[PDB]
Amino acid sequence: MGKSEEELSDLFRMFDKNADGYIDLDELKIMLQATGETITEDDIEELMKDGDKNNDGRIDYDEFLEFMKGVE
């Protein structure tokens, strides 16, 4: 489970299937897969824009918040 930065950190590295400290786009579409996210490929980028509004090519814990910001 992931609540505040206290657990967010662990919940973050736990989602990165590649296991490299960060999460790429090819892993995002699979990160929500465990939930059953069945959408076209044009909708995936719709989630990254929030996880990485800077579009630097990588999502870091610091940006992981802009995606969760306390959601449920």
Ligand SMILES: O=C(O[C@@H]1Cc2c(O)cc(O)cc2O[C@@H]1c1cc(O)c(O)c(O)c1)c1cc(O)c(O)c(O)c1
């Ligand atoms: O991106 C989705 O989950 C994100 C990852 C995630 C998680 O792994 C564990 C957890 O405790 C909370 C959590 O919130 C995330 C999230 C990100 C968003 O941008 C968002 O709008 C949202 O409602 C939530 C998502 C997609 C969905 O299609 C969906 O229906 C949903 O309810 C959620």
Ligand SMILES: [Ca+2]
């Ligand atoms: Ca990664």
Ligand SMILES: [Ca+2]
């Ligand atoms: Ca970024």
